[PDB]
Structures are given as C-alpha cells and as structure tokens.
Amino acid sequence: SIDSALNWDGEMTVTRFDRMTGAHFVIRLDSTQLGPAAGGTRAAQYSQLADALTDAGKLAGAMTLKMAVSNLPMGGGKSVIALPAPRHSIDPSTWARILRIHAENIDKLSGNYWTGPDVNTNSADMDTLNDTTEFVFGRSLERGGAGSSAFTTAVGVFEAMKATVAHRGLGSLDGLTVLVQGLGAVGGSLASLAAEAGAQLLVADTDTERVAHAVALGHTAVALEDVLSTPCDVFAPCAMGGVITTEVARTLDCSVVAGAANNVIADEAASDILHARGILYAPDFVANAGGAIHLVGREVLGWSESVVHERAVAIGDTLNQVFEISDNDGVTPDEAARTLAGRRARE
Amino acid sequence: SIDSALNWDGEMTVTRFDSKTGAHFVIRLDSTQLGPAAGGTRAAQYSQLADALTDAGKLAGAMTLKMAVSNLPMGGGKSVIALPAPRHSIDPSTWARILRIHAENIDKLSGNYWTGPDVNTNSADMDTLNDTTEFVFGRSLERGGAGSSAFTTAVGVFEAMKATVAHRGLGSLDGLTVLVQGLGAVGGSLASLAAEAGAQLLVADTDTERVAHAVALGHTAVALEDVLSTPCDVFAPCAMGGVITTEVARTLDCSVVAGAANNVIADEAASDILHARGILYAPDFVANAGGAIHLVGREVLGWSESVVHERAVAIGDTLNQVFEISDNDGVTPDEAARTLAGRRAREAS
Numbered sequence: 001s002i003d004s005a006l007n008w009d010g011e012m013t014v015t016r017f018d019r020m021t022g023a024h025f026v027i028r029l030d031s032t033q034l035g036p037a038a039g040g041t042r043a044a045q046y047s048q049l050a051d052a053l054t055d056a057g058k059l060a061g062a063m064t065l066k067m068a069v070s071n072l073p074m075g076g077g078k079s080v081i082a083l084p085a086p087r088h089s090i091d092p093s094t095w096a097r098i099l100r101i102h103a104e105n106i107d108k109l110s111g112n113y114w115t116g117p118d119v120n121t122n123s124a125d126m127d128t129l130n131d132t133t134e135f136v137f138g139r140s141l142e143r144g145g146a147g148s149s150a151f152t153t154a155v156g157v158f159e160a161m162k163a164t165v166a167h168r169g170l171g172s173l174d175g176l177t178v179l180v181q182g183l184g185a186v187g188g189s190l191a192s193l194a195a196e197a198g199a200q201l202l203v204a205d206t207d208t209e210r211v212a213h214a215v216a217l218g219h220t221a222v223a224l225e226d227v228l229s230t231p232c233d234v235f236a237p238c239a240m241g242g243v244i245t246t247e248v249a250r251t252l253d254c255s256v257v258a259g260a261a262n263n264v265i266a267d268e269a270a271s272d273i274l275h276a277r278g279i280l281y282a283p284d285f286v287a288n289a290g291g292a293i294h295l296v297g298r299e300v301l302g303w304s305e306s307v308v309h310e311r312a313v314a315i316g317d318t319l320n321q322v323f324e325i326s327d328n329d330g331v332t333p334d335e336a337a338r339t340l341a342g343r344r345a346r347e
Numbered sequence: 348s349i350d351s352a353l354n355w356d357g358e359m360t361v362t363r364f365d366s367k368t369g370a371h372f373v374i375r376l377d378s379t380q381l382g383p384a385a386g387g388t389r390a391a392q393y394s395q396l397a398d399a400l401t402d403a404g405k406l407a408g409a410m411t412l413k414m415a416v417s418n419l420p421m422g423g424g425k426s427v428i429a430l431p432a433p434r435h436s437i438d439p440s441t442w443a444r445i446l447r448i449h450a451e452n453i454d455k456l457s458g459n460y461w462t463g464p465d466v467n468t469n470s471a472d473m474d475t476l477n478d479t480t481e482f483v484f485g486r487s488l489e490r491g492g493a494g495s496s497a498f499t500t501a502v503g504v505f506e507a508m509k510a511t512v513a514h515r516g517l518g519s520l521d522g523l524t525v526l527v528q529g530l531g532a533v534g535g536s537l538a539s540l541a542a543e544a545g546a547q548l549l550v551a552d553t554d555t556e557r558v559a560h561a562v563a564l565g566h567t568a569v570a571l572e573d574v575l576s577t578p579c580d581v582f583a584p585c586a587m588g589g590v591i592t593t594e595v596a597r598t599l600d601c602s603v604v605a606g607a608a609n610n611v612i613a614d615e616a617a618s619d620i621l622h623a624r625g626i627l628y629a630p631d632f633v634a635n636a637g638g639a640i641h642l643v644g645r646e647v648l649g650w651s652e653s654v655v656h657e658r659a660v661a662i663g664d665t666l667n668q669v670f671e672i673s674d675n676d677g678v679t680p681d682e683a684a685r686t687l688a689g690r691r692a693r694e695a696s
C-alpha cells in the first residue's frame with residue numbers, strides 16, 4: 001500500500017531504475033541499531049512499484065526483529081529487485097547487468113548494509129555480486145562464503161515445529177499430519193525431517209516434478225487450490241508470504257502453524273484469529289532464523305558448522321520462552337515474540 | 348506520480364520519512380563519475396512527494412554539469428527536505444531534529460555525497476549537520492568551513508552577464524537596464540556590482556525592506572506581478588527557478604538572460620524560443636558555478652581566496668567558449684554548454 005510504500009518509518013530507502021533492463025532496485029534498511037543492516041536480495045516481478053516498496057519494507061522489519069530475537073549483532077535490512085520479466089526469462093547478460101548495478105548500490109552504503117541470497121538469488125549470484133562489492137554474505141564455499149543456509153534454516157524450523165507441537169499438547173510429530181506448502185530448498189529439507197520423525201506428509205508445490213518426486217518418496221500430493229482448505233495437524237508454509245489473511249485464519253483446518261516463509265501473516269487481526277481459534281502459530285521470525293544464524297554465525301562470528309547447527313536448534317527454546325510469555329501475559333505469540341526480541345535487544 | 352518520479356536515470360535516490368516531524372527527506376545522486384557527488388540542502392514545502400523527487404533530480408542533474416564545466420573534480424547530487432509546513436513555522440527544535448535526521452542519511456553514504464547550503468539552509472545548519480556527519484561544506488569559518496558562497500556566486504554571475512551582454516552587442520553594462528529578480532544574498536550583491544558598472548537597476552523582491560532599501564540606493568523597484576512584463580536590457584533571475592516557461596519565453600522583453608537561479612528554464616522549447624527571439628541566455632549551470640567553485644576550491648582543492656576569485660571570474664571566459672559553440676555549431680547556448688561540459692569532463696579524465 002501507499003502507507004507501507006511512502007510512509008515507511010525505517011531508517012533509509014534506496015531506489016534506482018535502469019532503463020537498459022527496465023528493472024527497479026529497492027534497498028530498505030529498517031534498523032542499524034544493533035549493527036549494520038543485513039538481509040537477502042529478493043528478485044521477482046511485482047504488479048506495481050508500491051508492491052515492491054511494501055515488500056522490501058515488511059521484510060526489512062522481519063530482519064530487524066529476527067536478528068534481535070536470535071541474539072545476532074546486526075540490524076535489519078532488505079533488497080528487492082523488481083524484474084521486468086520472470087526471473088527464468090531474464091537472459092544471462094541482463095541478469096548480470098542487473099546484478100552489477102545492485103552491487104554498485106550496496107557499495108555506496110559502505111558496510112551499512114550486507115546482503116545475501118533470498119528468493120531467486122543464489123550463492124553463484126553472490127559470488128557475482130562480490131566482484132563489485134564486499135558487503136555480501138552467502139558466497140559459495142570456494143569464494144570464501146558460508147554457502148547455502150537452507151539446511152540450517154530447515155533444521156531451525158523443524159525444531160521450532162517440534163516445540164510448537166509439544167506445547168499445543170499433541171505430543172510428538174509421530175502420527176501427525178503435516179502439510180508442507182512449497183517444496184523448495186528448505187521446504188523439501190523440512191519434509192525429510194518430519195517424515196523421518198513419524199509424521200505423515202501432505203505436499204504442494206507449483207512444481208510438478210517436485211511434487212512427483214515427493215510422491216515417489218511416499219508422500220501425498222495436494223492440489224495448490226486445496227491447500228488452505230486441507231485438514232492437517234500442522235501447516236508448514238515454506239513458499240511465499242502473506243499467506244494468512246483474515247479469511248484464511250478463520251478457515252484453516254489445523255492445530256499448529258510452523259514454516260519457513262517470511263511474513264506469513266497478512267494482517268494483525270488474522271494473528272488474533274488463529275489464536276482465538278486454538279491454533280498455535282510459531283512466529284516466522286523466530287522459527288525461520290536458522291539461515292541468519294548460519295550466515296552471520298559463520299561469516300561474521302566465525303562459528304563452526306556444529307555450533308551454527310546447535311544454535312539453530314536452540315530456536316526451539318526461544319519459542320518455548322515465547323510460548324511462556326504469550327501464555328503468561330495473554331498475548332498472541334507474535335506479540336509475545338516481539339516482546340522477547342525487545343528484551344534481548346535490551347530495549 | 349511517484350512511479351514517474353521513480354523513473355529517473357540517476358545513480359541513486361535515497362529517501363526517508365520522519366513520522367514525528369512529518370518531514371520527507373530526499374537525496375538524489377546524479378553522478379559520481381568525476382568524484383563524490385555534491386550539492387546543497389534545499390528545505391522547502393512541497394505539494395507532493397513526487398515533486399520533491401523531481402526537483403532533487405533536476406537539481407542533481409545541474410550539479411553534475413556545473414562540476415564538469417567548471418573543471419571541478421566532483422559529481423552531482425542534491426538533497427531536498429520536504430517540509431510539513433512553511434520553513435518559518437518550524438520550531439527551532441523540530442528543525443534541529445530534522446537536521447540530525449538529515450545528517451544521518453548523509454552519513455550512511457559515507458562520503459559519496461558532500462552537502463552544503465541551499466535554499467532555506469545556511470552555514471549554521473551546516474554546523475549542526477556537522478555535529479553528526481563530517482561530509483559538509485560551507486560550515487562557519489570558525490567551524491573550519493569556507494563559509495558563504497554568495498559573494499563568489501555573484502561575482503561569477505556578474506562576470507557572465509558582462510560577457511553575455513558583450514556578445515549580444517550591447518557593449519558595456521554602462522547605461523543598460525538590469526532587472527534583478529530576488530535580491531537575496533546573491534542578487535543583493537549582484538545589484539551592487541552591476542550598479543558600479545554603470546547599469547541602471549530595476550529590482551524586485553517579496554521582502555519589502557530589501558526593496559525599500561534598494562530604492563534608497565537609487566534603484567527603481569518593480570511590482571512582483573509585473574516582473575515578467577517589464578522591458579529591460581538584462582533579466583537576472585536571482586530567486587526561484589523555472590521562471591522561464593514556453594509562454595514566458597515568447598513574451599519576455601529583454602536582450603539577455605543572466606541570473607543566479609538554478610533551473611531557470613522551465614522547459615526545453617523555452618530555450619529554443621529565446622534563442623530564436625534573439626534573447627541571449629547565459630546557461631544557469633555555467634554562470635552560477637561561483638559557489639561550487641568557492642566551496643570545492645577552498646574546502647577540497649585547498650585553494651586560495653584569490654585563486655577562487657580568478658576562477659569565479661573565469662566564468663566569462665567559459666561563456667565565451669559556450670557562445671562560440673552555439674554560433675558555429677548552430678545550437679542553443681544550452682546545448683553548446685552541455686557539450687563543453689562533456690568535453691571538459693573527458694579531458695579531465
């Protein structure tokens with residue numbers, strides 16, 4: 001929206017347009033209070049510019065809280081690339097140009113912002129980015145990066161998922177029905193984990209091959225259009241965000257909500273509804289923090305692979321504290337989560 | 348439209364919104380090819396955000412040219428602070444907050460952008476900015492800044508007028524009728540120099556004591572509303588920019604245009620009209636370079652005041668060259684000058 005686009009209260013907004021490629025660049029820094037901002041680089045096609053600005057803004061926020069509640073020394077920031085065409089259609093030469101300019105933009109910030117991979121960006125691109133700028137996390141192992149953080153991400157979400165399931169009074173994942181939306185990098189990892197832990201897997205993905213294979217493995221396919229209406233014990237949104245609107249909140253058929261996506265909840269009211277409906281949601285910003293722990297832990301703090309792994313598992317604990325507060329003070333988890341980040345940031 | 352405002356070719360646009368003050372902040376970086384971008388801080392009230400945006404960019408564009416054509420090792424940028432109320436209604440407190448917030452943004456660019464005083468901004472505000480950021484030009488003298496660029500600006504503008512008038516075929520400024528619009532820091536001083544050169548002065552200004560004053564000095568005042576309908580030899584727009592519209596370009600009654608204002612031309616066609624009507628125009632980005640010359644010259648280049656002076660004066664020289672291009676090439680002075688800025692830029696590499 002316009003509010004969310006023009007009247008954003010973050011510390012800085014950076015924009016740029018390239019006539020050559022017709023692409024627009026957005027870099028939103030929400031907070032640099034606890035450290036330089038850091039956030040991925042999402043590249044995607046938006047209906048309107050304002051949608052691009054909105055997204056960069058909501059994500060940047062999530063980043064800020066995510067870093068604070070996870071005890072990372074950094075601020076929240078985010079970069080959005082409004083593509084002129086679908087990522088897959090972009091030609092190599094353009095992709096590269098676009099990447100080049102983006103990198104130029106980061107370099108201007110001079111360490112006030114550090115990027116990494118997000119939707120449609122990868123370790124190879126980071127490497128590419130790194131040819132112009134230094135403010136990059138997630139470059140491939142060969143270039144000196146910590147590489148991909150999906151796994152750390154998925155591990156975090158699994159631990160989180162387990163913590164949520166226990167709290168809700170469902171016992172263990174054993175014999176529970178888990179619905180995974182989005183079988184990507186993280187999504188697909190998380191399914192392996194849950195399956196292995198005794199859960200029945202219901203899966204959905206825009207990608208048929210993805211789906212086909214999960215089916216191969218003994219999973220159950222869900223038509224994209226039956227997703228939000230499909231009964232489960234747990235709902236794992238691991239695809240795009242803004243998935244839970246006020247209307248979805250009142251109709252979802254589950255007891256738990258735990259996934260990897262950023263910004264799952266569209267409106268504040270939705271979050272109240274789930275709550276009111278006896279649906280235990282684990283805050284996205286807590287749950288999906290394994291990727292940040294990984295990049296920051298490794299690249300910034302120099303943590304080994306194990307520590308990072310162990311810190312990501314500790315995500316479950318954070319949740320337990322979140323759950324304790326929400327339960328004590330009578331707030332939603334979301335709020336409860338917001339409360340603990342604030343306390344950890346020592347605000 | 349914002350979208351449209353966003354369809355700009357600058358290297359970078361920085362924006363921020365301050366809930367508390369309700370102030371919007373803009374920083375447009377046109378080019379950092381010759382060096383860090385630099386340009387003043389304009390504080391004003393905008394109708395829309397898209398407006399502030401278009402301005403900062405228009406201005407940022409002018410700066411890139413001014414640096415280049417003036418043989419300055421810098422790029423161009425401009426900050427625009429969109430006010431939530433008129434400058435005068437802003438409480439010293441809010442203003443200080445706004446300044447600080449301003450200063451943080453600048454800080455984020457870490458040297459890629461150097462600022463200075465512009466409209467509604469002064470040495471003092473620069474001193475304050477300086478409390479937070481270090482990339483400020485035009486700080487008080489005692490703060491270590493080079494102070495006020497006004498007088499150098501006027502000298503430069505002055506020198507340009509003379510050369511222009513001369514090329515026109517008006518000979519000297521002696522006996523001519525000069526119409527000075529806006530007698531601020533710059534115009535005030537220009538009137539003064541024009542006066543002693545023998546010119547006759549018509550003056551105009553919203554400030555009535557400034558007008559009262561010029562009147563007492565022999566000068567003839569002019570009604571605001573009659574500013575563009577007054578016949579003169581030279582028109583010196585020393586207040587707001589974009590005063591030259593297509594419609595105004597066609598009815599203007601003078602033989603030369605030479606002022607201090609940025610973005611005099613409100614439109615392309617206007618420059619063609621004047622050119623075709625035989626009204627000789629000294630391109631703004633060329634003639635108003637006196638201030639950048641001073642600031643950079645002293646604060647970056649470490650130049651002597653005397654040297655800065657020769658350079659501000661050398662502005663005529665550059666205009667002679669501009670004219671020449673315009674005359675041989677068959678182009679408006681506007682075009683002849685961007686060209687020159689273009690050449691100097693390349694040779695400068």
Ligand SMILES: NC(=O)c1ccc[n+]([C@@H]2O[C@H](COP(=O)([O-])OP(=O)(O)OC[C@H]3O[C@@H](n4cnc5c(N)ncnc54)[C@H](O)[C@@H]3O)[C@@H](O)[C@H]2O)c1
Nearest residue numbers: 153182183184185186187204205206207239260261262291
């Ligand atoms: N470290 C991470 O990788 C990480 C960290 C934090 C949060 N997140 C969030 O996780 C989400 C993506 O995770 P990822 O990197 O594994 O993704 P990815 O880009 O590999 O995931 C794409 C997956 O989503 C699927 N998908 C897209 N739209 C879908 C839809 N409507 N229904 C079903 N499947 C759909 C694709 O087909 C594919 O399987 C985003 O919101 C991202 O911001 C991920």
Ligand SMILES: NC(=O)c1ccc[n+]([C@@H]2O[C@H](COP(=O)([O-])OP(=O)(O)OC[C@H]3O[C@@H](n4cnc5c(N)ncnc54)[C@H](O)[C@@H]3O)[C@@H](O)[C@H]2O)c1
Nearest residue numbers: 496500529530531532533552553554586607608609635638
């Ligand atoms: N270094 C400089 O000072 C500098 C350098 C480059 C270009 N310029 C350009 O020169 C102009 C002069 O600004 P300045 O720094 O001398 O500021 P200033 O505030 O001292 O001068 C503006 C003056 O013009 C008057 N004015 C404003 N609106 C008017 C109107 N509608 N009609 C008539 N007069 C009006 C004001 O009363 C004031 O006295 C600006 O447009 C600026 O963009 C100045």
Ligand SMILES: O=C(O)CCc1ccccc1
Nearest residue numbers: 038039040115116291292
């Ligand atoms: O948390 C996310 O969704 C993205 C993680 C991240 C963290 C730091 C830099 C880039 C991406």
Ligand SMILES: O=C(O)CCc1ccccc1
Nearest residue numbers: 385386387462463638639
């Ligand atoms: O020429 C101008 O518009 C103003 C002079 C200036 C130069 C460098 C930085 C700020 C202002």
Ligand SMILES: [K+]
Nearest residue numbers: 170171172174
């Ligand atoms: K169970």
